[PDB]
Amino acid sequence: KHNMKAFLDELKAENIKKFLYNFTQIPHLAGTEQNFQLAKQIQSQWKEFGLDSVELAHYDVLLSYPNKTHPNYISIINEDGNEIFNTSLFEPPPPGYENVSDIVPPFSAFSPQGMPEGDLVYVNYARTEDFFKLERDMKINCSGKIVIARYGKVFRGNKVKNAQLAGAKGVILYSDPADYFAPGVKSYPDGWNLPGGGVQRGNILNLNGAGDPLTPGYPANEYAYRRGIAEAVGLPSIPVHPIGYYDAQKLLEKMGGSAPPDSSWRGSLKVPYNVGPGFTGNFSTQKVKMHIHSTNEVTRIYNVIGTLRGAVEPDRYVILGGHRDSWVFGGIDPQSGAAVVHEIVRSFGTLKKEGWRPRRTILFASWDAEEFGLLGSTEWAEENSRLLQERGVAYINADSSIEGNYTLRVDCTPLMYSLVHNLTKELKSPDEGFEGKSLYESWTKKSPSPEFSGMPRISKLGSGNDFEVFFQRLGIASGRARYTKNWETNKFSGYPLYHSVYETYELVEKFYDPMFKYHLTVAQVRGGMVFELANSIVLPFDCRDYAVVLRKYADKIYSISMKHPQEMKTYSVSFDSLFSAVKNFTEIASKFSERLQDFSNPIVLRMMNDQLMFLERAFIDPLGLPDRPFYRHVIYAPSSHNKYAGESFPGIYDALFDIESKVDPSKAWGEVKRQIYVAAFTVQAAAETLSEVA
């Protein structure tokens, strides 16, 4: 039989291992020859594996690279202008890789050039609330200062935006052992902790879903018109550079000015964590000087696009996509995910060679330039938006398969909750002490839902990965799954080696998943989800699960507004319409579910599958969210304070955020009411797509 069980049994841990090894022997930085060579390899193998068609789709996008002959670094400089301390020019390479070429040195992609000098201010995680605390409570002014911030908690792009708006003239990012060094584990190569010389690479853009900075709206093809750099989307206006904790220590140890406001501001280094500005007493005339010479350059990138044509509905697309470009070796990010995709394609291809085809078309994608701002997936979606809008059933992401070895983590649209619960009940738990138990059981035990007993936690989608254009811009039901750490122990990284040279095949094989069983489990979840989305006669979406969460999010946003009862009275701010729309959605969804259970008629079916498919689509507002035209989903957007986190009813949330500080409360509360209207309308309009069609 050709069924999901045949698909799943064909997946092998040993294949995933072989592929991960294959993909991580040299760096595959976006826009480099080696990543083009890997693209061509993946293309050839996917064809070998049996896909109907496998093409490269290329774009010429803005990327950023250090200058090979004019290295970036930071100094402490004395009154005479002698540089008395310099940060490192590279991470000491790991054992056996000390002769590997083309390791990009740590840098912040898209930093402008500059050599600003000044006094340091320490800003904790550089979150919105850290700057509130500095400026409002401590009366510390960041204007004209170089800010130093620890990585963690939020997307580093948001940190840089926040520092810019505080008037900083430069930003230094560092990894604090409080956040990147787990107690009682050794530094790489002897354990999975970040060494003092390790540094986290990463882009610092604020694209808000735009894709390539030069071509928002349109693919960056051969004849594209490009914005000038001064009009580019999302570029930071001040120099930024990342360093490890050995170097950070040397920068922080001399810090003077105000004490940290409380212990949530202290990391684990042996320094006071003084906020500054500037150094204590004897060193008060010393400054910090940055030297950034990176350049932005339009560079060719290559996605691999594989197609397995559907037997019955070839014009319905289920997409499995994840990126292939890495900062250095990408042992976890992304190749632990890409090796899984490779095995999934191989398995589907084995069935295809035996005469099977899925009901709907499956598209497989190896995205490029994800690390520079989701550029590959976003340009390809801009190119193909009309096909995706009208034909796209679902998008399943496939970045890092592991960030820990503790339990499953899934983030997806509510439309896939039921699919995920059912599939995980049919898979074996890989966990020690759950042998012979289902993945659902182990997951639910380790990561219980906060709302319901006997259910597992499933989170909303945030962003900072390649599902962003499919979900937040285009409104295609999207999901992701991976193995993760125990977030109950502490909220620190389950992979501190993230974006460092130490993130290697050996890291994975020695410390995370020596038997590749977590990778195999993740291949079964991602692969199984794609199998069911592509093969189930009725799309495996339960619209009733959206109704339950919509009520949750409405209760939540209402409770935020209710902190301001006087203003709600004064400006007649009512959530009645939103609750009414949510009630209607619940009633209509329930009736639709009954018809879906109760109808041999392929037009009714397809009509009903179209209503299922276009339901996520109905939450798209073509006017987008305020000043974020590429975030169009009215229920979910990336948090304006942290691109990685999702926010529910983002339009209302942002209108309410910090509202007591607005200088014109009438105007601010007007805008709250406007967003309530937009949300109520969109929920009601989505509900009505599920009514009888005539």
Ligand X SMILES: N[C@@H](CCC(=O)N[C@@H](COP(=O)(O)N[C@@H](CCC(=O)O)C(=O)O)C(=O)O)C(=O)O
Ligand Y SMILES: *[C@@H]1O[C@H](CO)[C@@H](O)[C@H](O)[C@H]1NC(C)=O
Ligand Z SMILES: *[C@@H]1O[C@H](CO)[C@@H](O[C@@H]2O[C@H](CO)[C@@H](O)[C@H](O)[C@H]2NC(C)=O)[C@H](O)[C@H]1NC(C)=O
Ligand U SMILES: *[C@@H]1O[C@H](CO)[C@@H](O[C@@H]2O[C@H](CO)[C@@H](O[C@@H]3O[C@H](CO)[C@@H](O)[C@H](O[C@H]4O[C@H](CO)[C@@H](O)[C@H](O)[C@@H]4O)[C@@H]3O)[C@H](O)[C@H]2NC(C)=O)[C@H](O)[C@H]1NC(C)=O
Ligand V SMILES: *[C@@H]1O[C@H](CO)[C@@H](O[C@@H]2O[C@H](CO)[C@@H](O[C@@H]3O[C@H](CO)[C@@H](O)[C@H](O)[C@@H]3O)[C@H](O)[C@H]2NC(C)=O)[C@H](O)[C@H]1NC(C)=O
Is 449 in the active site? Answer: no
Site string for ligand Z, 283-302 (x = CB under 6 A): ------------x-------
Tokens of 327: 């900062």
Task: Match 């400006």 to its residue by tokens.
Answer: 571
What burial class does residue 6 get, using C-beta atoms within 10 Å of its C-beta: 0-12 exposed, 13-18 middle, 19+ buried? middle
Q: Residue 548 belongs to what H/E stretch?
A: helix 543-561
Give the whole-angstrom CA distance, residue 670 versus residue 283. 51
627: contact with ligand U by CB under 6 A = no
What burial class does residue 280 get, using C-beta atoms within 10 Å of its C-beta: 0-12 exposed, 13-18 middle, 19+ buried? middle
Contact at 8 Å (CB) between 269 and 177? yes
499 is in an annotated binding site: yes
102: contact with ligand Z by CB under 6 A = no
Catalytic residue among 258, 418, 438, 574: 574
151: contact with ligand X by CB under 6 A = yes
CA within 13 Å, CB half, 120: 32
Q: How much of the chain is in helix, strand and coil states, percent to nearest 5?
A: 40, 20, 40
493: contact with ligand X by CB under 6 A = yes
Site string for a copy of itself, 16-55 (x = CB under 8 A): ------------------------------------x---
Is 574 in the active site? Answer: yes
Give the whole-angstrom CA distance, residue 647 versus residue 480. 17
333: contact with Zn ion by CB under 5 A = yes
473 is in an annotated binding site: no
- Select the residue interacting with ligand X from 465, 535, 561, 648 (CB under 6 A): 465
Closest distance of CB 584 from ligand U, Å? 4
Rg (CA), the chain: 25
Selection from a copy of itself, Ca ion, ligand Y, none that 212 binds (CB < 5 to 8 A by kind) is: Ca ion
Is 291 in the active site? Answer: no
Tokens of 437: 């138990």
607: contact with a copy of itself by CB under 8 A = yes
Q: Residue 544 belongs to what H/E stretch?
A: helix 543-561
Contact set for ligand Y, span 101-160 (CB under 6 A): 141, 143-144
Of the pair 322, 540, the CB lying nearest ligand X is at 322
Which of 235, 231, 239, 230 minimizes the C-alpha distance to 205? 235
Which of 451, 623, 678, 622 minimizes the C-alpha distance to 551? 451
Catalytic residue among 509, 567, 610, 621: 610
What burial class does residue 566 get, using C-beta atoms within 10 Å of its C-beta: 0-12 exposed, 13-18 middle, 19+ buried? exposed
Site string for Cl ion, 354-393 (x = CB under 5 A): ----------------------------------------
334: contact with Zn ion by CB under 5 A = yes
Cis check for the bond before 277: say yes or no (omega within 30 of 0).
yes
Selection from ligand Z, ligand V, Cl ion, none that 480 binds (CB < 5 to 8 A by kind) is: Cl ion
Q: Which stretch binds ligand V (CB under 6 A): 237-245, 277-285, 418-426, 566-574?
A: 418-426
Give the whole-angstrom CA distance, residue 197 versus residue 507. 17
- Select the residue interacting with ligand Z from 6, 10, 12, 41 (CB under 6 A): 41
- Select the residue interacting with ligand U from 577, 593, 644, 674 (CB under 6 A): 577
Helix (H, G, I), strand (E, B) or coil at 547: helix
Give the whole-angstrom CA distance, residue 637 versus residue 651. 9
Task: Match 């970040």 to its residue by tokens.
Answer: 194
Which of 598, 616, 638 minimizes the C-alpha distance to 685? 616
Spatial strand order in the sheet of 146-150: 120-122, 146-150, 170-174, 240-243
Of the pair 398, 573, the CB lying nearest Cl ion is at 398
- Select the residue interacting with Cl ion from 75, 208, 397, 447 (CB under 5 A): 397
Strand partners, 396: 320, 479
Site string for ligand X, 384-423 (x = CB under 6 A): ---------------xx-----------------------
643: contact with Cl ion by CB under 5 A = no
Selection from a copy of itself, Cl ion, ligand Z, none that 84 binds (CB < 5 to 8 A by kind) is: ligand Z
Is 633 in the active site? Answer: yes
Q: Which stretch binds ligand Z (CB under 6 A): 6-14, 41-49, 453-461, 527-535?
A: 41-49
Selection from ligand V, Cl ion, Zn ion, none that 397 binds (CB < 5 to 8 A by kind) is: Cl ion
Which of 45, 63, 64 minimizes the C-alpha distance to 54? 45
Going by C-beta distance under 8 Å and a sequence separation of 6 or more, which residues neighbour residue 475? 389, 616, 617, 618, 619, 620, 632, 633
Q: Which stretch binds ligand V (CB under 6 A): 315-323, 415-423, 480-488, 583-591?
A: 415-423
Task: Match 């292939």 to its residue by tokens.
Answer: 324
241 is in an annotated binding site: no
Site string for ligand V, 571-600 (x = CB under 6 A): --------------------------xx--
Of the pair 20, 121, the CB lying nearest Zn ion is at 20
- Helix ranges restricted to H, 104-170: 128-132, 156-165
- Select the residue interacting with ligand Z from 5, 9, 70, 562 (CB under 6 A): 70
Closest distance of CB 83 from ligand Y, Å? 26
Give the whole-angstrom CA distance, residue 194 versus residue 197. 8
Counting every residue written for the chain, the total comes to: 694
What burial class does residue 488 get, using C-beta atoms within 10 Å of its C-beta: 0-12 exposed, 13-18 middle, 19+ buried? exposed
268: contact with ligand U by CB under 6 A = no
481 is in an annotated binding site: yes
463 is in an annotated binding site: yes
Q: Which stretch binds a copy of itself (CB under 8 A): 321-329, 369-377, 424-432, 682-690?
A: 682-690
Give the whole-angstrom CA distance, residue 371 versus residue 591. 44
Of the pair 173, 686, the CB lying nearest ligand U is at 686
489: contact with ligand Y by CB under 6 A = no
Closest distance of CB 429 from Ca ion, Å? 42
Residue ranges binding ligand V (CB under 6 A): 418-419, 422, 540, 542, 597-598
Q: Would you name the residues annotated as active-site residues? A: 370, 574, 610, 633
Contact footprint for ligand Y (CB under 6 A): 141, 143-144, 192, 404-405, 494, 511-512
Task: Enumerate binding residues for Cl ion (CB under 5 A).
Answer: 397, 399, 480
Name the binding residues.
156, 203, 215, 218, 323, 333, 370-371, 379, 382, 399, 463-465, 480-482, 498-499, 643-644
* Chain residues that interact with ligand X, rule: CB under 6 A: 151-152, 202-203, 333, 370-371, 373-374, 399-400, 464-465, 493, 495, 498, 643
Which residues are at the interface with ligand U (CB under 6 A)?
Answer: 222, 577, 580-581, 584, 680, 684
